[model samples]
Target: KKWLGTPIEEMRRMPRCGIRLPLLRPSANHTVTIRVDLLRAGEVPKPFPTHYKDLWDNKHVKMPCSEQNLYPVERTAGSRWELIQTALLNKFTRPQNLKDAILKYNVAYSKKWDFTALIDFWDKVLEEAEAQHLYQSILPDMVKIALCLPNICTQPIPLLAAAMNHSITMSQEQIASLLANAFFCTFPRRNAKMKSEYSSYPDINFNRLFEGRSSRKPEKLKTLFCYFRRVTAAAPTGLVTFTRQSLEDFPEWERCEKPLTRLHVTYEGTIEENGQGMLQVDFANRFVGGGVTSAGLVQEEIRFLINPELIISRLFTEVLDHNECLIITGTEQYSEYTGYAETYRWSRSHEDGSERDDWQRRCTEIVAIDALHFRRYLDQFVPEKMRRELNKAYCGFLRPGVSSENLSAVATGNWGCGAFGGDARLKALIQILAAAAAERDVVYFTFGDSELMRDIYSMHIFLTERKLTVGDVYKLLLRYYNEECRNCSTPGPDIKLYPFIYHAVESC
Candidate 1:
C-alpha cells in the first residue's frame, strides 16, 4: 500500500523541511521584534536605567534593588536587594552563605522551606573537587552575571502575555543574566505572597526549585548546575526567540477539505533526540513550564530540565489560553538525561550541534501546547473537549503568515495520554487531523511503544487509502463519540477507538 505521508528522512532532505527562519529586524507582518543590540552589531547592548514600575504599564526591568518594598522589612536593616547582593557577591560565598542570604531576606520562608535537597546535592551528588569548583568559581561568576543583568538586558523584556500575538528575541547572554538573578532569588515581588502584581506571570525566583523534598530535586539541581557551569565557562552569543501565537479564528473542522499531510511513526527514540529538525511539541501545562520548579518530572518538565533556558518562559508567560501556544526557538540542550519522573537522572553534559539560522538562532523550534487533563477518561470523549484539543493542537501546528514552502512537520506523540487520562488513539487522530489542516507532516514518536506505532501507522494507511479529508476524519471522530461512546452503558471495557473508526469509515 502507498504510504500516507512523506518519509521523515526524505522530508528533512527537502529544501523547505524546517520552520520559516525569523527575520533579525522587526516585522509588522508577523508582529516579531528583536530585543538584542542590533544597531551596535558585535558589541553588547548597554543597560537601560533600571526602574521599579509595573511591567504591564512600561516594559522595563524592575530592578530588585529599587526601593519599592511592597512587603514591609525591618526599618533598621538593609533592603532585600542589599542582603541578596551581599550574600551572593561575598568573596567567601558558599552554599550555606547563599542559603543564609535567601533566608535573611525571605524570613517568612526561613522556617518552612527546606534546603536539604540542595545541600545534599552539593555534598553527595558532586565530587568534592567539582563542588569546590562550583563554590569557588561557578557561583562567583553566576553572581556577577546576575548583578550585570541591568547591563546585559538593555531593553525592557516584554511579558509573553496571554492571548497576544507577539514575539521577542533576546541574546543568550540576556537569558543567562536573567536566569542567574532567578537562581539567587533576587527578583522582587515574585514570591508566593506577592501575587497581586505578577499573579498572571509564572514564578521567576528559583526558591521553589531549591526547597523541594523529592529525590527529583537533586537530579533537577544537577541539570541546572550543569547549565550554570556551561554558561559561565563560555557565555553563549546566539539568540533565542519566545513567540506567543494567539489564534483569533478556529478552523472549521466540519468544512475543512485538507488531505492528510504526512505521517511517520517511530516506536523508538524521543521527540527531542530524534525529532530534531521538525517542530517539536511540548505537552505542557497551561502554566507554561508546569512543575519543573517543583516535583514535576514528566515529558514537559524533563524537556525544560535538559533545555533549562525554556524555564525563563515561566517568568513572563501567562497561563496559556485554549486558543494560544507558545513557540520557543534556539534553546540549546545542556544535559544528557535518562529515565522518567522519580527515576530521572542527569547523565552527563551534552554538546549541542544543532544548526543555526541566518539570525544566529538554533534551527530547533518548540511549540508548547497544554493538553486537557482528564480526571475521568470518559470526560475526554465529550465533543467540546475534543474540539478544544483539536484547536489547541492546530494553534501549535499552524505556521501563520508563512508560505507552504516554509512549513515544517510536527514531532509529537502520546501527548496527554500518560497521566492526563487521554486515549492515545484519539490523541493521535487529533494531532493527525490538526497537522493535515496546518499543511504539515507529522513524525509521531511513540516513546518505545511499538504496538502503538504499528496501530497508528495502520490507521493512517486505512484513512489515506480511502482518500479521506480532515473533515471526514473529524466527522468520524464525532460519530464515534456520539454514537459509540455517549450511548455506552459503562466505561470499563477498553473500547478500541481506532477499530471503531476503521469500521465506520469502511462501511461509509
Candidate 2:
C-alpha cells in the first residue's frame, strides 16, 4: 500500500517479482539455440558408476547401525525408558485430556472411533507402563507440543511467508519430545477440511499409524521406538535448521547461458547414503507430508517416515507452489529403512557423521521441491506444463550467492516418476537443465533403474559434445513439442513417453 500519492496505475506499473508465467513476457533470447562443435569431444571418459560397497562407505565418516554399537531398540523397559516416558507424560496436566486428544485425532481418519475403548486401553498402559518390562511410549508431550505451534500466522500460508526461514532451534531431547507428540497424534486440527483456509497446509498428526491393528503395526512401532530409545538415551548436540525459499520471481530458466559441468549418474544407493555434504532432494507434495498421515507411502513419505523429524517442517511450512521451495540445514537422520512403499520398514538407527558448519548443525541439508502433477498424460507435454516444471526445479536449484565453487551437488532420483505418473526421461532432463541454469552440478541417483542410469550418462556425453547451453536446452524442449505434436495422426512415438529430446538431439 505505497501511498505517498502514488496512483493506482503507477503502482500497477511498478516492477514486482514472481508474476505467474501467463503474465510474464518471455525474453527474446529465450528462443535461440547454439549448435557449435564442443570445446572437447574426442575423449569423453566412460567412467564406471561410483559404488559404495556398504552403506557406511560414503565420503563422510559413516556410522554403522548395530545393536552392538548403540542399543537402538530396547526389548525391555529400563530406568532410561521410565525417565523419558515420565518426562513426556508429565507435560500433560490431565490424563482425561490426553484420552480426549487421542480420540479426536483418530476421528480425523478412522471410521471405527471409540472414545471409551481408547481411554480404557490408554489407562491400562499408563497403569502398567512403569512396571512393564518393555516400555513402548505414548504421546506424553502433547500439551507442550501444542504450545510450540503458532497460535496465529499473520501472513497467508501457501506463500512462503518471510520469517519461515527463521529456524526453530531444538536439541535431540526436545526433538524427541515433539515427535512423541506426533507419534501420539496430538497436534490439533491438522486433518483439515478440503475447502477450508487451513486446507492449504499439510496433515502432521501421526494418529493414522495407530488407527487399526494392521500388519504394519509391528514394523512401524519397532522403527519409531528404536528412534525414541536412541535419542532419549543420549541427546545429540547442535541445532537443526528449516528454511523456505518462496521465489519472488521466476527463474532464469529459458535464458540462462550457464554451461553444463560435471554430471554423474548412479543406479544404486539412497540419497542419504550416497550424497553426503550435498543438498538432498525431498520429492515433495505441494502440501508436504504426502500420504504419511494417510494410507499411501511413496519416496517422499518413506523419507519422512524414516527421518521422522522431517515432519516438523510441515508444522510451519506453507503449502508449496511451482516457483517455491523449502530447504533445511542440519536435520539429523535417526533411522534407516529397508523397503519401498507398502513394504517399507525402518531397519536401524543412523549416526550421521557429516561434519557441521558454523551453525553447530550437521552438514545435512535437504531441499523440498514439488513436481508437476499431471492428471492427463498428454498435459505434461503442453508448453505451459513444461515451463512450470522447468521453473519449479530451477527455483529450487538456484541458490543465491552460492556459486559452483561453494555449492554442493544435488542428490535426487525418480523425482515425480512414481505416483504422480511422470515420464522418467523427461523428468531427468528437466532436472539437468534446471541444474545447468543454476550453475550447479548434479549427482543423479537412478534408484537402481539401470536403463535410466545408462541413458543419462550417455546423454550427458551427447549434450556436452554439442556444447549446449541451458538456453539451448529450453530451445530443444520447444522444438521437441513442435515436432512431436503439431501434426500427429496417432500423436507419433516421439510425442508420448519416448524421450523424444534425446532421440532428436542424438540423431542431429
Candidate 3:
C-alpha cells in the first residue's frame, strides 16, 4: 500500500549463499563499579585475598526432600529443577506487592517442592559476602545476571588486536565480573535438555555445585570466594586474552613436513603450574573449558576450576577441530592442589613468576588441543587417527612467525588417557611424534606415573640413538602394528617396542 517502497519480503529475501561479516564492533564490556574507579586512577593493585580462607563453617545446608536426603543424595538426575525453584524463593525477598524474586524464575513454580536447606546455604553465602564490601542486594544482582542468559554483556568484546586475530583480550578485572555472574547461577538456557545447545561450550553457571555437598565443595568454595575477595578490594593489573581460531579449509600438514629435534620426560607437577615461560598443552574438548561449570571434574575440568578465568573463552570461540586449537594468552593460575579426583584438595595460592611479552601478555600461553577419544585401545594404533593427532598437535605447537629455535618447549602429559580411554603409551608416542614433526622439543610430565616415565624415556632414547627421522618413526609404527597383530590382537604394557627396534637395527 505504501508508494515507492519495494515489497518488504524482497528486502528479507534469503541470499543464494549465506555470508559472514566479521563483527567490527568491539567485544562486550561488563564492568563492575569498584574496578572502574581504580582503573581510572591507574592505581590498580595485584589481585587480593591471596590466601584461601575457610569461610562460614557453621551452616549445614541440607534438607530431606522426598524419601531421599537431597543434601548428598548419592543419586543423580535432571530432578533439581523444582528444588532450584524452591531454594531461590526461600532465599530472596521482594517488594511488598510482588512475590519473591525467585517467583520470576525462568521455570514454573511447584507446590510439591520444599528445599529450605538450599536457601540456608546461600543465605550463609550472602552473610559472608559482606566481608568483601559487596553490599548490593543479592537478589537484584542475580536477577540482572539471569536476564543476560547465554550471552552476557555487549557486542564483540575483548577489544580485538591485530596480533590476536579473532580473539578478545581482557584483563583480570573483567574476568572477575563475568565470574561473579557465574558464581550466582545467573546464566540461563544452560541446562537445556538437548546437549546440542551447549555441545561446544562448558557449563558456565554454578547451579549443580549448589545442590551437592561433599568434602570437596568447601575447598572449591574457598578458591572461588578467595577470588571474589581479591577483586572486590582492588582490581588486578594483570591482563589476559582468549581467542578461538578456526582451521583453514586447507592445512599446512598436507604440504609441510618438519622434523622435531628433542623431547624430555619427567614425573612431577601440572602443566599449568610447572610450564611457566613455555607453551602449556590443555588436553581440551572442541569446547574450551570442557564440563567445568557442570559436575564433570576430569583433567580439563580440574584445570578450569583452578584458573576459572579460562571458562570465559566458551562465550566467543567456535567449536574447535583437528586443524585448529585455541590459544589463551596471559590468564593467571590462582590455586594449587594436592591430589586427583576424590582425593583432590586445594593446597594454597601460587604467584606466577613468568616474564611478560612485548604485547603485555604473560610469557605463559595455553594451547588447547583435543585428542581423539578411542573407544577401543587398539583403535589408537591406526594411521588415520595417528595422522589426525599429528596434525592437531603440530598446528598447536607451530607459533606463527616464530622458528622452533626461538620458541620454548611444550609441556604435556597423558593427554587423552583419563576419560577419553586413550592408551597411555600410544598417546605419549603421538605427542613425541608430533613434536618431532613440528621441529620442536617437549617436556612431558608424568603426574607420578613412574612406570610411564621409565618406558617413554626408553622409547625416546631408542629413536634418538638411531638418528631416526619422523618419517622413519612413522614407518616403525606401522611395522610394529603389523608384527603385533600377527602375534596378538591388542597392544599391551608387555608388548614392548624394544623388540621391533632391535629387529629393524639388525636387518638394516
Candidate 4:
C-alpha cells in the first residue's frame, strides 16, 4: 500500500507526459554501432544486433510502448500498463542509437567495405525507405527521433591528409547533403568487430597499384599542398603566376601572399576512378554534398632532398603486375597533363633477377613542398646558407643532359626555357631545389642510414610554410607521399607529412 502511492483504480493518475529533449546536430559522431548482414542481398533475419532483446523485455515500459508518453489526459486506453514499460525503456535507450523499431524480417549483410561504409550504407537504406514512405506512421515523435539519428552514431574523425581534395569549412548545405544518420555513423564501427575474412587490400591504395615502383631509384620526398576552388572558365587551367610582392596585398588564407604563382590547370571535370580524386572518396568516406564527383588534374612538382638507392629496396610501390599506362597528375607551374611510366622488379623482391621494364606501371611525378618558401627577387627571405644547401641538393640530382643553368632562371615572366620546360628530370630536379630551400622540415629515409632522416625530415620543411590556397597543390602532394614513400597510392595511407588547408567560397 505504501509503495503504491495510489490505489490500482487511481494508479493511472501518476502517468504523465514523457517529454524528450533532443540533440541539435546530426553526424557520424553521434551514431550507434550496428552492422546489418546483407550477404544474400535480400535475406531477412540474416544477422543483426539483439538490442531489442532488452528493449522489448517484459519489464520494458517506456515511450515506444506507452500512450502516457503521448500526453497525460484524464483517461486513456494505453494509459496504465503502457506507463511502466515506456518509462523503463526510455531510461535505458541509447541516446545516440536513433532508429525506428528495426525489422529483421527483410534485411541482409554485405561482406565488403570497412566500418565506415557499413554505417553509411545503412543510413542510405533508411533515407531511401523513409523518403519513399516505408513507414505508415509519421507521428511527431517519430519525426523528431529520425531527425537526430545521424550525428550520434560515430566519431567525427578528420582525415589527416597531405592532399585530401574536399573542404573542411562547415556548411549547412554540406551537412544536409551528407548522408548522415545513426546508421551512417555506426557503419564502420560495426565492421571493426566482425570477421576480417574479406580481402579488401586492393581498392584502398590506388597510387602504388597504378604508379608502380623499383623501376626508378627512390627520390627524396618533399612537402606538397593541393586544393580546389570554384572558378568559371577563362582561368588558365595549366598555370597562373602569383608574385611574392603580392603577399602585402592580400591576407594569408584569402589568396596566396605570393604573386606570380602558376596553376597546374584550373578546370572542373569528373573524378577518374584511378586518379587521386577517386582516392578522396574511397578512404575519407566523407561526402561534402550530393552529386559530388569531380576534381581537376594538375602536373606534379615534387620537392625533395636527394638519395638514389630505393631501386634495391623491396619496400617501394610494387605495381608492375598491374596496368602500365596509368595517368598520374598534379598541380604545378601553368600546366596540367598526364604521363605514363614503367615499373620493374629487381631488388624490389627478394628474388634474384635482372631489372626489367614494365610499361603498364607509371605516374607523372609531382611534389609541392610547403616549407620551401617562394619569393621573387628576394633570396634574403630565406637565408644564404640554406640557399647554398639547396644548390648542393640540386646539383646532386642533375643527370647527363640536365643542367644547373636551367635551375637558376629568374622570374623573367618567361618560364618557357626554365628547368621544367622540356626535360622531365630537370623539372624533377627543380622540385628538389625548392625542397632544399626548406631543409629545416625535410626528412630523408634509409630505414637505418644516417641520411634516412632526410626522408622523414623533409616533411617538416613542407609544413612550416603553413600557407593556404585552393588549387592543384594537394594533387601532387598526395601522389608523392602515397606512391613515393609508402609505395602505394592511397591518400590516407600516411599523408600526415604536410597539412593542406583551403578556403571554400560560400556561394561557389
Task: Score every model by TM-score.
Answer: 0.91, 0.70, 0.70, 0.17
> lDDT scores for all predictions?
0.78, 0.57, 0.56, 0.20
lDDT of 4 by residue, 1-508 (tens): 1111111132111002111213222233221122222212122111122322213222111212222223234464333223322322331122122221221100122222223222232333235544233223222223233233223112222321212121111111112112111112211111233434212111111012112122221211100000101111111112101000000111111122321111111112212211121111000111111011111111111101010110101111112110110111221211122231222111211111111111111111221111122232122112232333223222222212323222211111111112222212222222333332212111111212323223223332232244322112323333343343444333233432232212221111
Candidate 3 steric clashes: 6
Off by over 4 Å in 3: 1-103, 108-155, 158-165, 195-199, 249-257, 486-494
State the lDDT at 42 in candidate 1.
45
Better of 2 and 4 by lDDT: 2
Model 4, backbone clash pairs (residues 3+ apart or across chains), number = 92
Q: Write the per-residue lDDT of candidate 1 for residues 1-508, one digit (tens) a residue.
A: 2222457676542224645544466554232223434524344333333432224243334556554533455555456666666667676434677788667667777877777777777776778888888889888899888877645665556766666788777777778888998887777767766567677667778887877557788889889989999997787867788899888888889889989977888887788997877889999998889888877899999999899889998876888989999999889999999899889999999999887676667778899999999987778888899999999999998987775667767889899999788989889999999988888888988887888888889898888988899999889888878877786778643456887887887777
Once fitted onto the true fold, the runs of candidate 2 whose alpha carbons sit more than 4 angstroms away are: 1-101, 104-169, 191-197, 486-508
Span of 10 residues, lowest total lDDT, candidate 1: 45-54
The segments of candidate 1 whose C-alpha lies over 4 angstroms from its true place after superposition are: 1-6, 12-23, 26-61, 65-79, 91-94
Q: What is residue 413's positional error in candidate 1, in angstroms?
A: 1.2
Candidate 1 vs candidate 2, lDDT winner: 1
Cα lDDT of model 3 by residue, 1-508, tens digit: 1111122122211111112323222323321112222332234322222221222111110111111222223465433334443544443342211133323332433232232323434445435644223324434343333332223222113321212345555556656656665555433434454655444445555655544545455556555555555555555666666665544443333343445456567676667766656668888987677766545566876777777777767654556766778888777677777777676667877665655443344556788899888887666666677778877887777755545455666778888888889877767877877776655667788888877877777777776777776777777777776666434644562466656766776599
Question: Which residue pairs clash in candidate 1?
Answer: none
